[PDB]
Chains A and B, each alone.
Chain A
């Protein structure tokens, strides 16, 4: 007899055992080298899906741009980006009519937010493409570098501390004859108008790793800092709009998505009488981002912001204006090998414009030949369409408009449709009195989608009777069925620290028990395995064992020293008291009454040199990138113990010409620590104002010395010493 697990589906329905079809117990695919090939392929594919448009050359950037809008209507089922302006404007108008007051309200709240938003909001972001160094750097670092360059060039309106003023300075920089940047190898280099325009309109391309569910790798993009404020405002407007649309599912979580899917299916099927047939289409959109033209987003926003202050319209329109002229950096480059001479070489992507094509294979040779005409200063113009879901929410708005355009008031026919859209994925429930009606409805829905630059993937889509469908790895079969294979990768040690890892593991087990219908015995097994892996990872074994490690000696002496050994934490080699009933309690508090007072005091000592807290945002928040989803943050319950240390940093900056960044880091951190000691609320509430550091610090020294004498340790001798030391630092700052 030959064993075959798949035959199990002959008795258990597919959805009731779908977890077996998710090989999420092995290493996910990773990219190894350059992503330049993928970037070039994506650029060429985006440009050839809109080949029948019209070509122009921008007078500012001098780059060739392709406009397919209002182009010839498609005559085949292949992907097409020839969106029609009038059709999309009409779709938005119908969306407004079905939801009166949506645009005006959303614009009002967006106007409030834009005129009260601060610059620091831009620091709350992941890697961004700093143009000062032409590389990806943390959002805060890139923002600081750009602000420094602007201030050095004379653009100091951002000193007002307002994001709108920062954007005003950004736009004013566009009209400058010559800017100056700094490079280390420090050298001051001058950038002319066109070079700075291209550096501000460019995107950095990388390869996406840890992407499960496809054989081929893809490319993703990261924009600069000049354009992120406009993107933030536009996405704020789009989120405020989608929050008023029940057909959208992008700005919500997973459980809300499931609830809305259940509600829509029940509404569609229940209202349908015996005569009407119902069919569900589990649709995926092929080349979703490559076929969405930024000009059409400009049209949608300018229709949304009608009868609004002109400044609001301008600030919200700046973003799509820059995306329509966006450029993409090709990537890291290409690495060549010569086996005859036994050597390797790494050529940067910027040489692709001039480098001969003898080194490249046929596929890459043709890709380079096709993309060369669009190469301007080492970057390729990508006007026709978006690169990687930067306007997720606006795309969801367009999809929701398409979904609502079939409310049976615009169809003008017996058939009708509804459903749920989340960018690149949708479920469409279509009802009609007969199979011919369903066919006509789906055909018209597809045709209308093709008029908006949205394509339906026929290969990854199928239609059945309502009651069974899929949506973003959520399988609905007369009710959503748990999978538990999507969350399997999150059952190990997170990698934050000991206490954080313990709390995160127990909380993940608890949550997957609540949401993903994890069984009790399975949860106990998960707890046991997690504890085993945790002890084997942090070298913290039970203590009563003879497992020799680098940490087994101190742990054993602590074990033999303690009297009530049941109170020792698993991190210190103690027994595990966790169970299904204790999954919502931190380890420290669960073992508090069992700890010896000496060990308890040594553990939770504020003066410990290991605990370090930076800001209110990073107290008990851990960023865990979930499998098959975007990066997410979790609140984990933990007590600040000596085990809450933060791990070592990379330390490879020491071998790079960018070595002075570490000295600047140290000096900035010293100044920030001094300010915090002067202003204790610096971390919890970020200080605001327009004065400089030393003014506030010296003046508060004055006052605090005064009052702490009026009652406290200070003495006249010390108070006068502080006053004249303040005068000394004053005259020092003078010179």
Chain B
């Protein structure tokens, strides 16, 4: 039958009908009479629509061939011959522009004169039944319907026929051409009734070929095919198989509970080796401040001018000389770098306006100090294979180092009060609710407690230094840059003040990965002689740069004044995390506020004021040789803030591992102290897990010592 559509109809219509065939997903080889019927429907749609044009009037202009002009409007514009999505697109667009009603089924054409749709259907059966059939299929329709049938008859409601009658003679001539051409073909044994509305399909997902063999190799050891295994599974029913293997399984497979008593836990062993060194990016306990007493705010001002003005406030400069060498570098380079920094600072002082940011010369001194041109050149393996020295990067456990007493004192003095306010908080919306007033009062109390704390000063120092370093690295990637360490505080009298700890020289910072390292050299003034705790300054070079006179009742001290100079490095991640050190304030004060709220849930009243003023209640916050010492809530605030600050400063994988594996043991010990009969399956394994995190970090070793002390004081 398909030979007929090969022969007669034009290409355009046959591929339109083929795409309509693909539309609903049925195959053309099984039933083709539908293809012919609907392609004839589509053909009558065209032949009825084309050759029919309109101009600004009604009364369509009919031309056998559209002449070249702007007057190519089509009388009837076709609906079908398009995908369902576009057919409904045209339906909705016509409804929204023509203000007509939206039909629920697919029309075939639209006309302007009568401003409505045409649903053309030419069926094998006579018209006077198919018409009202499709009419009762369509609900309350104003779209006019018109149908032909092979006998040659026409019909329509309203007795309406919308265009010329010679066109309809055309239609029925086409119709009988179709008819008495099948006459030569002979199809009416099924042509009248060949489609009955079949819609059914079964989804087929068959495993075959290579993928089947893979299925045959992904079974238990004693199975040969997926078919057999699935049959076995379907036939499988529970018949007490877990019990049999449990009985047969060796009894050494057990989870015996070892009781956890007061005498069970042993102190954590600390590693032994050379004392632990300093790792901070700046001096914390041995910092010195040169000040100007200016009225500018933290960010307000220009760095270089402030630094120069602060440094001019000090008199007593001496020619620098080596006091304590780096022990691994070239100290003369550090000396020359310091003198170069001074010289270029003067050079800025001379000229017209202090630059906002200064670049330094790339001398051999800072070329060595900043580690320039030291990365091995990257080459290909095929060119370097016979080199005996060629091997992997050194990948082994870090060097072992024992704890020293300097970190303990540094933390002790990091929780001490100061003679300045190191936090100038921002603005918030004016409090409107009583709860907001309570929150503001609490916040004011904590700010009064923590602002005068060395932890806040360290927070500001780190934030400013890391912000400046990151910005300089991102801006001046190539050229070495000078950045004075600046921090602005407020005195007890209320006068604002600036403080200059020293200088940082940032080097080449072409940082691609988050782990890539930018090297800088840090110089900081101090008065602490490095000849008393040399092991804490393994990586520092310390010079003697001047003498300071601070008013004291013992005449006047006239102390020496040294310069701690070192080469340090950071990374994008480290800079970003060090510039978010202000969340240590959060951590600490959230803990304290949780304490206050928990206690106030007992007594139905806010308990902040008496906690902060009466200072009756105290918490164990340290141990003295006499015994455990307790301090007021403010001291707890400062201690927790210092702990968070040191966590942010000495952060490392060792800290995370020890924190987790020691929190586990802390929970076990707490369960013991709560009389909850705690038990363990392998306590030695937990101890070994904790002890492997303690390698060389001073902070984690101090935490381990604190944990041992807590165990000793606990378990009683």
Within 8 Å by CB, do A and B touch in the complex? yes
Does B261 lie at the interface of the complex (its beta carbon under 8 Å from any beta carbon of A)?
Answer: no
Q: Are A5 and B621 within 8 A (Cβ)? A: yes
* Interface CB pairs A-B, < 8 A, 16: A6-B709, A37-B395, A73-B248, A75-B253, A89-B236, A215-B656, A336-B391, A344-B375, A345-B380, A443-B255, A519-B590, A521-B589, A525-B586, A578-B428, A579-B429, A582-B429
Q: How far is the CA of A711 from the CA of B97 in the complex (A)?
A: 7
What residues on A are CB-neighbors of B428 within 8 Å? 524, 527-528, 576, 578-579
What residues on B are CB-neighbors of A524 within 8 Å? 428, 436, 439-440, 443
Does B229 lie at the interface of the complex (its beta carbon under 8 Å from any beta carbon of A)?
Answer: yes
Q: Are A460 and B664 within 8 A (Cβ)? A: yes
What residues on A are CB-neighbors of B82 within 8 Å? 699
Q: How far is the CA of A547 from the CA of B356 in the complex (A)?
A: 12
Query: What 0/1 pattern do residues 197 to 217 of A give for CB contact below 8 A with B?
Result: 100000000000100111110
Among B97, B233, B436, B655, max chain A CB count under 10 A is at B233
Does B2 lie at the interface of the complex (its beta carbon under 8 Å from any beta carbon of A)?
Answer: no
- Which of B128-136, B550-558, B638-646 contacts the other chain? B638-646
**In the complex where A7-B622, A345-B390, A723-B72 touch, is A21 in contact with B659 (Cβ < 8 A)?**
yes
B17 CB to nearest chain A CB (Å): 15
Residue on A nearest B702 in the bound complex, by CB: A4
- Which of B35-43, B87-95, B278-286, B541-549 contacts the other chain? B87-95
- Which of A265-273, A314-322, A371-379 contacts the other chain? A314-322
What residues on A are CB-neighbors of B591 within 8 Å? 17, 19-20
Q: Are B446 and A491 within 8 A (Cβ)? A: no
Option from B211, B376, B585 in Cβ contact (under 8 Å) with A175: B211
Does A188 lie at the interface of the complex (its beta carbon under 8 Å from any beta carbon of B)?
Answer: no
A509 CB to nearest chain B CB (Å): 10
Q: Which 3 A/B pairs are nearest by Cβ-Cβ distance?
A: A26-B651, A459-B685, A215-B657
Does B529 lie at the interface of the complex (its beta carbon under 8 Å from any beta carbon of A)?
Answer: no
Q: How far is the CA of A347 from the CA of B218 in the complex (A)?
A: 34
Q: How far is the CA of A575 from the CA of B430 in the complex (A)?
A: 11
Q: Are B580 and A295 within 8 A (Cβ)? A: no
- A37-B395, A343-B379, A346-B378 known, 12 other contacts, Cβ within 8 Å: A7-B623, A7-B713, A8-B621, A20-B640, A69-B220, A69-B221, A462-B667, A462-B678, A526-B586, A533-B579, A581-B432, A716-B71
Residue on A nearest B99 in the bound complex, by CB: A711
Does B188 lie at the interface of the complex (its beta carbon under 8 Å from any beta carbon of A)?
Answer: no
Among A20, A58, A93, max chain B CB count under 10 A is at A20
Option from A4, A364, A581 in Cβ contact (under 8 Å) with B433: A581
Does A14 lie at the interface of the complex (its beta carbon under 8 Å from any beta carbon of B)?
Answer: yes
Residue on B nearest A214 in the bound complex, by CB: B657
Q: Are B639 and A5 within 8 A (Cβ)? A: yes
Q: How far is the CA of A528 from the CA of B423 in the complex (A)?
A: 11
Q: Are B205 and A688 within 8 A (Cβ)? A: no
**In the complex where A58-B217, A73-B250, A545-B300 touch, is A215 in contact with B653 (Cβ < 8 A)?**
yes
Option from A94, A338, A470, A703 in Cβ contact (under 8 Å) with B93: A703
**In the complex where A12-B595, A84-B245, A536-B467 touch, is A1 in contact with B70 (Cβ < 8 A)?**
no
Q: How far is the CA of A523 from the CA of B586 in the complex (A)?
A: 8
What residues on A are CB-neighbors of B514 within 8 Å? 30, 209
What residues on A are CB-neighbors of B321 within 8 Å? none
**In the complex where A21-B662, A306-B234, A338-B391 touch, is A461 in contact with B93 (Cβ < 8 A)?**
no
Residue on B nearest A10 in the bound complex, by CB: B620
Q: Are B233 and A10 within 8 A (Cβ)? A: no
What residues on B are CB-neighbors of A546 within 8 Å? 296, 300-301
Q: Are B643 and A5 within 8 A (Cβ)? A: yes
What residues on A are CB-neighbors of B299 within 8 Å? 536, 541, 545, 547
What residues on A are CB-neighbors of B703 within 8 Å? 6
Q: How far is the CA of A128 from the CA of B657 in the complex (A)?
A: 31
B641 CB to nearest chain A CB (Å): 10
Residue on B nearest A351 in the bound complex, by CB: B381
Does B364 lie at the interface of the complex (its beta carbon under 8 Å from any beta carbon of A)?
Answer: no
What residues on A are CB-neighbors of B22 within 8 Å? 690
Q: Are A580 and B433 within 8 A (Cβ)? A: yes
Query: What 0/1 pattern do residues 588 to 599 of A give for CB contact below 8 A with B?
Result: 000000000000
**In the complex where A60-B210, A520-B436, A521-B439 touch, is A485 in contact with B220 (Cβ < 8 A)?**
no
A109 CB to nearest chain B CB (Å): 16
Option from A9, A12, A295, A464 in Cβ contact (under 8 Å) with B710: A9
Residue on B nearest A217 in the bound complex, by CB: B653
Among A3, A56, A164, A335, max chain B CB count under 10 A is at A3
A-B CB pair tally, cutoff 8 Å:
547
Does A562 lie at the interface of the complex (its beta carbon under 8 Å from any beta carbon of B)?
Answer: no
Q: How far is the CA of A484 from the CA of B387 in the complex (A)?
A: 54
Q: How far is the CA of A723 from the CA of B703 in the complex (A)?
A: 81
Does B679 lie at the interface of the complex (its beta carbon under 8 Å from any beta carbon of A)?
Answer: yes
What residues on B are CB-neighbors of A32 within 8 Å? 513, 515
Does A442 lie at the interface of the complex (its beta carbon under 8 Å from any beta carbon of B)?
Answer: yes
Does A67 lie at the interface of the complex (its beta carbon under 8 Å from any beta carbon of B)?
Answer: yes
Query: What 0/1 pattern do residues 31 to 57 of A give for CB contact below 8 A with B?
Result: 111000100000000000000011010
Q: Are A90 and B710 within 8 A (Cβ)? A: no
Tell me the chain B residues, 568-591 only, with Cβ under 8 Å from chain A. 573-574, 576-587, 589-591
Q: Are A30 and B70 within 8 A (Cβ)? A: no
B657 CB to nearest chain A CB (Å): 3
Does B681 lie at the interface of the complex (its beta carbon under 8 Å from any beta carbon of A)?
Answer: yes
Q: Are B211 and A318 within 8 A (Cβ)? A: yes
Query: What 0/1 pattern do residues 373 to 410 of A give for CB contact below 8 A with B?
Result: 00000000000000000000000000000000100000
Does A735 lie at the interface of the complex (its beta carbon under 8 Å from any beta carbon of B)?
Answer: no
Does A577 lie at the interface of the complex (its beta carbon under 8 Å from any beta carbon of B)?
Answer: yes
**In the complex where A338-B376, A576-B426 touch, is A54 in contact with B221 (Cβ < 8 A)?**
yes
Does A561 lie at the interface of the complex (its beta carbon under 8 Å from any beta carbon of B)?
Answer: no
Q: Are A19 and B587 within 8 A (Cβ)? A: yes
B558 CB to nearest chain A CB (Å): 32
Does B523 lie at the interface of the complex (its beta carbon under 8 Å from any beta carbon of A)?
Answer: no
Q: How far is the CA of A311 from the CA of B207 in the complex (A)?
A: 9
Q: How far is the CA of A491 from the CA of B644 in the complex (A)?
A: 15
Does B494 lie at the interface of the complex (its beta carbon under 8 Å from any beta carbon of A)?
Answer: no
Tell me the chain B residues, 103-152 only, with Cβ under 8 Å from chain A. 112
**In the complex where A174-B210, A361-B392 touch, is A4 in contact with B242 (Cβ < 8 A)?**
no
Q: Are B624 and A2 within 8 A (Cβ)? A: yes
Q: How far is the CA of A445 from the CA of B674 in the complex (A)?
A: 27
**In the complex where A346-B378, A580-B436 touch, is A65 in contact with B90 (Cβ < 8 A)?**
no
Q: Are B656 and A28 within 8 A (Cβ)? A: yes
Does B312 lie at the interface of the complex (its beta carbon under 8 Å from any beta carbon of A)?
Answer: no
Q: How far is the CA of A383 from the CA of B456 in the complex (A)?
A: 55
**In the complex where A2-B412, A359-B391, A579-B432 touch, is A528 in contact with B640 (Cβ < 8 A)?**
no
Residue on B nearest A58 in the bound complex, by CB: B217
Tell me the chain B residues, 238-267 only, with Cβ under 8 Å from chain A. 238-239, 241-242, 245-246, 248-250, 252-257, 260
Q: Are B590 and A10 within 8 A (Cβ)? A: no
Residue on B nearest A16 in the bound complex, by CB: B598
Query: What 0/1 pattern do residues 405 to 426 of A give for CB contact below 8 A with B?
Result: 1000000000000000000000
Does A13 lie at the interface of the complex (its beta carbon under 8 Å from any beta carbon of B)?
Answer: yes
Q: Are B384 and A456 within 8 A (Cβ)? A: no
Q: How far is the CA of A230 from the CA of B435 in the complex (A)?
A: 54
**In the complex where A26-B647, A324-B218 touch, is A359 in contact with B390 (Cβ < 8 A)?**
yes
Does A27 lie at the interface of the complex (its beta carbon under 8 Å from any beta carbon of B)?
Answer: yes
Q: Are B640 and A522 within 8 A (Cβ)? A: no
Q: How far is the CA of A87 from the CA of B431 in the complex (A)?
A: 64
Q: How far is the CA of A346 from the CA of B383 in the complex (A)?
A: 12
What residues on A are CB-neighbors of B205 within 8 Å? 164, 167-168, 311-312, 314-315
Q: How far is the CA of A295 from the CA of B115 in the complex (A)?
A: 67
Does B594 lie at the interface of the complex (its beta carbon under 8 Å from any beta carbon of A)?
Answer: yes
Does A560 lie at the interface of the complex (its beta carbon under 8 Å from any beta carbon of B)?
Answer: no
Q: How far is the CA of A546 from the CA of B302 in the complex (A)?
A: 10
Q: Are B589 and A525 within 8 A (Cβ)? A: yes
Residue on B nearest A723 in the bound complex, by CB: B72
Q: How far is the CA of A360 from the CA of B393 in the complex (A)?
A: 9
**In the complex where A8-B620, A73-B250, A488-B583 touch, is A334 in contact with B392 (Cβ < 8 A)?**
yes
